[PDB]
Write a protein that binds this DNA or RNA. Sequence first.
RNA 1: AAUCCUGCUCAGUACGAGAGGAACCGCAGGUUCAGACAUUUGGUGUAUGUGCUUGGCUGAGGAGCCAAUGGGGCGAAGCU
RNA 2: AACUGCGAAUGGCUCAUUAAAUCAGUUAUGGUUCCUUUGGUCGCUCGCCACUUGGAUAACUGUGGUAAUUCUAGA
RNA 3: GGUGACCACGGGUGACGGGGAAUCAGGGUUCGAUUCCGGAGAGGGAGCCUGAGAAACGGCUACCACAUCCAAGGAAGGCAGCA
RNA 4: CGUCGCUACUACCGAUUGGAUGGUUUAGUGAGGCCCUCGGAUCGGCCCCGCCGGGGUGCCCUGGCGGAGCGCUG
Lengths: 131, 172, 116, 178
Amino acid sequence: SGAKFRISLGLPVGAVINCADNTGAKNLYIISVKGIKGRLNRLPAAGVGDMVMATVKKGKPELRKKVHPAVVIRQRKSYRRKDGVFLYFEDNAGVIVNNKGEMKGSAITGPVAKECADLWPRIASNAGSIA
Amino acid sequence: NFTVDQIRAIMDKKANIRNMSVIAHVDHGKSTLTDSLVCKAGIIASARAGETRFTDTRKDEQERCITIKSTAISLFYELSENDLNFIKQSKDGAGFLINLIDSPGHVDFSSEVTAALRVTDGALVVVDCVSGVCVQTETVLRQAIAERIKPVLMMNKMDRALLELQLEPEEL
Amino acid sequence: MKVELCSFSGYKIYPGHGRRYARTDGKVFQFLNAKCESAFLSKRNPRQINWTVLYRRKHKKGQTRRAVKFQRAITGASLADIMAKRNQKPEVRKAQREQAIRAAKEAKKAKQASKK
Amino acid sequence: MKLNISFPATGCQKLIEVDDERKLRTFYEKRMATEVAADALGEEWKGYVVRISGGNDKQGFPMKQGVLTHGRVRLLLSKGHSCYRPRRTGERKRKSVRGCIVDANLSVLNLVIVKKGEKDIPGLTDTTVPRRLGPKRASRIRKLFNLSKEDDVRQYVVRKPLNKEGKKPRTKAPKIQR
RNA sequence: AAUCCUGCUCAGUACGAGAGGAACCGCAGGUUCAGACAUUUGGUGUAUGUGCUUGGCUGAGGAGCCAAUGGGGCGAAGCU
RNA sequence: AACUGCGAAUGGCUCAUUAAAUCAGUUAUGGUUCCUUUGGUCGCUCGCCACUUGGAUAACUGUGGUAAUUCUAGA
RNA sequence: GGUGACCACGGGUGACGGGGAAUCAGGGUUCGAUUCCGGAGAGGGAGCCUGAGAAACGGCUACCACAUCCAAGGAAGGCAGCA
RNA sequence: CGUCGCUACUACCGAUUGGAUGGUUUAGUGAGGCCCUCGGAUCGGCCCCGCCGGGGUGCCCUGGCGGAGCGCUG
Ligand SMILES: [Mg+2]
Ligand SMILES: [Mg+2]
Ligand SMILES: [Mg+2]
Ligand SMILES: [Mg+2]
Ligand SMILES: [Mg+2]
Ligand SMILES: [Mg+2]
Ligand SMILES: [Mg+2]
Ligand SMILES: [Mg+2]
Ligand SMILES: [Mg+2]
Ligand SMILES: [Mg+2]
Ligand SMILES: [Mg+2]
Ligand SMILES: [Mg+2]
């Protein structure tokens, strides 16, 4: 397969990111990061391609007071792509998925990081284009 | 791969039709055998090798890769005259039509097995040569022979015995 | 030795250098350094920045046709014959026009005979 | 990469495949409507000069002169610019066109011969195909045949002979106008 | 003074009626920690390095200065 | 087959919008435009081709590109 | 300055307007999307070429809402026309 | 006749900066179109003016090959 290399994290717990899908949500409030053991006082952080748990603060009322899986697809902190490219995006954004990784929405607004696209196939199939 | 005209032209003959079902224990290769015979024969059935053929019509059936629903297909073909001499039944011409019914192999789908048995007149029984006769093959054979179906046997996965098991010829 | 990038300022961005930026509209840009990146974010046109390649090109810093007369063949004729035909003898040409004159004269004679 | 070579004086434009960017560098970073030396494609091609007439992209989008970009951009196409045909009078249509800058990201390069080298490549620089139709205008045929003042212009049109095995071969002349 | 996990192959395999469902070798990576380091990206920045600019001051220009670092843009080396 | 000229702005459907708005009557446009039809006007001006001037461009023949379009380039 | 209890202004309409339809002592009261005339529109706006005539949509261009193929580079949409 | 007790329905007030669906807008961003001011990638024409062919007789008729004039122009 080939796992994702490490990237600069940038987005800790408490961050509010855009929701790029078409579920009617507006933003995701990251409440945790999947697969992070942690350390004393170290806030759990997530980069692109990571799965987070989030609650939407704005959006359709049937989505708001619930916890949802999500995957970060664009981040504003620059990350190295193991070939010299220090790439960063204009905004922090993610999409809402389920546990198996299927995207709850059906279209993705804006670009999607290559790490996210390679880690998740169905996100890639919904992606407008890859940056 | 021909039009429905010759389908009717071979359908009206009633001594060259063979309504049959394939029956086996789970994880024995029934879907694989059905799709290989779809690859070879078929009224319009082609030889696509994209995993599973039309016998898995359901998205969940393909997703979990457990056979659920039964789908009936038709295989028309022809064989040589010196081999037609072997058929001691009622024969007519060169074209032969088969109505295969792929029934699910789980014990919980024995109702679909019975429903398929009502339609069918002959059966192919499939047995893995590694596992031998398991529970479900015995049960479906009981059902078929109570429904008065002639079964013909076929041992699948000989490659498993000759490579995975490394069986010598005598014990094979 | 990857693909040789180009910043907005036109300089060749070498591998391991610079920084790439992906806007949300799907447009990807490359900046040679933080100076280039900060200027682009400030939305200052490179054409008013005295040291950029676009500026030098715009300010001109550091800085025919063929009417041919081919003569070929024509379908249904001969290449060797057509040049001779178009360069025929002027004596032959004047003989041709006078024989056309007498052809017209005898056509008048025939027309008068038919109309009579 | 496919490359059409078109000789004006002879016609019979042909296709050549090339798989050496080592010799395609002499066309890299050029522009169309410019003339280049085609000698890098062989000693057989030495002494030959061409002009970049056109090309077809990797996508199939033809390249139009007057883009100044090594790639495709969308333009507003009105009547008679290039790469467009109007279905209605004055109709316009936005469609992408490959730029005039030539590089490796193409499929077909259309080159026109402007100078003939010593080594005539067979098929292209020989067996000149004739002009498709004889001139139809009176002044055209007059100027071409150097006829001064009515030298049997009535008969001096080329009579095209039609020949085929399952018929009776004949010849017929066009109608002269003006 | 190293620590632990995940994914691929094993394998939809052994096992099991079925549902489900591993492991050894190997491979690719990460968590936590440790020891360093500045090629790259970022941070700093009084090189008070170079532009811009507010008020005042040297008769004006030029060049400058003061406002406890005048403010700000970019910034070498170094440190990180 | 194609260029050119004309038609495609008529007809068909539907009543969402629209409350002096639309629309109905009446009137004006001496405050404006108007292909098409018809009737006027077309030697009314003093001004080395006129037995007639130029370059192409279609359609057409060949080279094609694109997975693809009533997509199009080169000669 | 202009318009307003002679109802301006605003809101609503399940309002296209009329010629007209129903009911019928007389007076009136409901209904008119509906084949005639006028108006508006072509999924929502907007802006345009051609053309005497269009802000045309079985013309174009851009955004938006939907949605088709795709080899993932791309192309192509408008049945409130007859079915 | 009314209170209180129970049962169904119907509305009312009600913290919740309640929520949803239309419309109209301030501000900002603003695609695209058109107009204007530039822009001149190319395509021609005049000045061929290097050649050959040449002409009433190198004093060319120019059919053309072809450097170019590298100016004047649409
Ligand atoms: Mg703590
Ligand atoms: Mg005529
Ligand atoms: Mg000062
Ligand atoms: Mg001064
Ligand atoms: Mg002080
Ligand atoms: Mg700084
Ligand atoms: Mg007209
Ligand atoms: Mg209404
Ligand atoms: Mg009505
Ligand atoms: Mg009407
Ligand atoms: Mg309209
Ligand atoms: Mg319209």
